[model samples]
Target: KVFGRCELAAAMKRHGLDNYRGYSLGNWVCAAKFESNFNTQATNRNTDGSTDYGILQINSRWWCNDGRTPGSRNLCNIPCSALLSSDITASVNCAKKIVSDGNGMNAWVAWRNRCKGTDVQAWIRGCRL
Candidate 1:
């Protein structure tokens, strides 16, 4: 599903992303925008043959098993395909696990580069959530 900006804000917010792991709701929303542009089915292939899946861009190498990546061990024990659906449950849950790894939101590069120290509240502003 390709979520509207506000729609994605509500989606992640309702799923417990507000102040999740010390990051604000807007941080999560902004990261997803930089990660996958709110598209659940988004995928990116890395030069290492690893692939990123879904809004949070969970990596096949370390987070999910895509049956292709050379570094996959399914750390989150999730199937990569499971993150490609409209429901953000799997992706949201997995994202929590990633930050729980002690790397914080920097686990996702887009979050580190595009979301860190930006105008956080702007991500969810004007939304009727």
Candidate 2:
């Protein structure tokens, strides 16, 4: 179940993520757009041989495990496939834990390369929360 930007924004708000972990909703929205384009099932294989999973494109190296990910700490204690589901609760919870782990949104390459220091308001523009 892929969500539109507005739907994604609304969900984020409904989930009380508007200002989660001292980061604004826009930051999360922007990260989600570039990370996985709001697709719950999205996954990507990095050149380093690690796979990213789900809407936030969480890395397998430290977050979740797909069994094939060597040295995966599985800090989220979730199967990487669990992040691919339409019910985003697990993904969201894991994401929160990721941010709380100390890197903030810097954990995401997309956020560092794209959303940081940019006008992120557009990510949630015109979205009714």
Candidate 3:
């Protein structure tokens, strides 16, 4: 299942995101490549015949767990597809907050690498944790 993965850099461009703070364009590009290959419509197996959908490869269950969302319909509903749409900046900002556990991207990155025993620079360098 492939989507507009290549459009991500353009998505970033549309928001004037010249660069991400902890990631270089190369890293962002590579991450996008590895994750969704710039496909906004990508969906993959979750091992139970269900799917994880969209460019960031998000699980719909994780993306639309809230009551206001499509909820149970997320299986047939590509709820996370909006993550790459015009609302992407807002979505990214929100996602950063969640990933960082409310502290934001830097904190999210920090928390991700908390068990890695690596510095921020190192984390930024290798896309680890």
Candidate 4:
């Protein structure tokens, strides 16, 4: 399922993205824009051969176990398929775990390159709740 900006904003906020672990709604929106454009079925196979999955693109390397990654820690303790659904429960939970692991929102290099230090409010601007 693909989500419109405000739709995603409201959903993500409802799942705890709004000021979650110090990262704001704008921060999450901007990263998701770069990650998967609010598409729930998105996936990116990385150079390490691990894939990133879902709208948040939670990686298979440390977050979810794809059973393909050679050294998946599966810190979220969920299958990679769990993130592919529109439910987003596993994705949001995994995203929270990433920040708790010390990288904060810096877990995504995309977020670092695009969202960090930038006023990402535009990503969520006009997004009503």
Candidate 5:
């Protein structure tokens, strides 16, 4: 977990990490740890032999065009699917948009709705920094 946080913080620092501080980055990181132990290359086979892959736990066929592989185009630019790219910038930026949208704490709220007491960056009723 520390390694993952350091890795993510280091990558974002080059682009002004503080600007994005109080958002889902922490939750995203926690989610990664919870779901895949921050394993960017983790892959799982569905019962039907379909696949889910990457740190943010993306389903391969749903997001990727390249036959359920780690690196694919469909998963890159899209906000939700971008988390599968293993690209820190892509994932962080996508998370930023979700957290900082006009819906005001909508990102945190959405996560909170389902993540209550999950401890994967446990959600707050009022998202504090």
Candidate 6:
């Protein structure tokens, strides 16, 4: 399921990401925009032959399993495809675990490349909640 930026922001807020682990809603919003453009079904092939899954692009290398990949740590113990669902509950939970692993948003390349030091507030602008 694809979401508009505001819709994604509101959903992220509902999941307590408004200020999760010292990261703001704008941080998540900006990361999601660059990660997968808020498309829940998004996927991408990485240089290591791993795949990134869903809206947050949770990687198969360490977080979730896509079955085709072999080295998944499965920290979330969930199928990567589950992250592709319209409901983002599982995805958000997995993301929290990822962030807690001392990487914070650095776990996401998009966050490092695009969101870091940027004014992410524009991503949440006009977002009503």
Q: Number of the top candidate by TM-score?
A: 1
Cα deviation of 126, candidate 6, in Å = 1.6
Whole-model lDDT values for every prediction: 0.90, 0.89, 0.44, 0.88, 0.48, 0.90
Which regions in candidate 4 have their CA more than 4 angstroms from the true location? Answer: none
Task: After superposing candidate 1 on the true structure, give the runs of residues whose Cα lies further than 4 Å from its correct spot.
Answer: none
Alpha-carbon shift of residue 118 in model 5 (angstroms): 5.9
Write down the worst ten-residue block by lDDT for model 5: 120-129
Clashing pairs in 2: none
- How do the residues 1-129 of candidate 2 rate in per-residue lDDT, one tens digit apiece? 898998988888787788897888999899998899889999899877689999999889999989887788999999999999998888888999999985799998999999999998888889888
Runs with alpha carbons beyond 4 Å of true place in candidate 6: none
Cα lDDT tens digits for candidate 4, 1-129: 998988888888898888887788999888888888889999998899899999999889888898999888999999999999988788888888888985788888789988899999888899788
Q: Rank all candidate structures by their TM-score, best first, as comma-separated numbers.
A: 1, 6, 4, 2, 5, 3
User: Candidate 2: where are CA atoms >4 Å away?
Assistant: none
**Best by lDDT, which number?**
6
User: Candidate 1, TM-score vs. the true structure?
Assistant: 0.95
Compared with the true structure, the alpha-carbon lDDT of candidate 4 equals 0.88
Q: Write the per-residue lDDT of candidate 3 for residues 23-69, one digit (tens) a residue.
A: 43433434445556556556576654344444445545444332333
**What tens digits encode model 5's per-residue C-alpha lDDT throughout 31-94?**
5555566666666667653465555454444444435445444534463444555665554554
Q: Which lDDT value does model 5 have at 3?
A: 36
**What lDDT tens digits, residue by residue, belong to model 1 across residues 22-108?**
888899888899999998999999999999999888989889998999968798898999999999999999999889975888777
- In model 5, the Cα lDDT at residue 2 comes to 28
Screening candidate 4 with a backbone cut-off below 3 angstroms (N, C-alpha, C), the clashing residue pairs are none
Candidate 1 backbone collisions, by pair = none
For model 6, residues 1-129, the per-residue Cα lDDT tens digits are 889999999999999998899998999989998999989999898788789899999989888888877777888999998999999999999999999975789988999999999998888999799
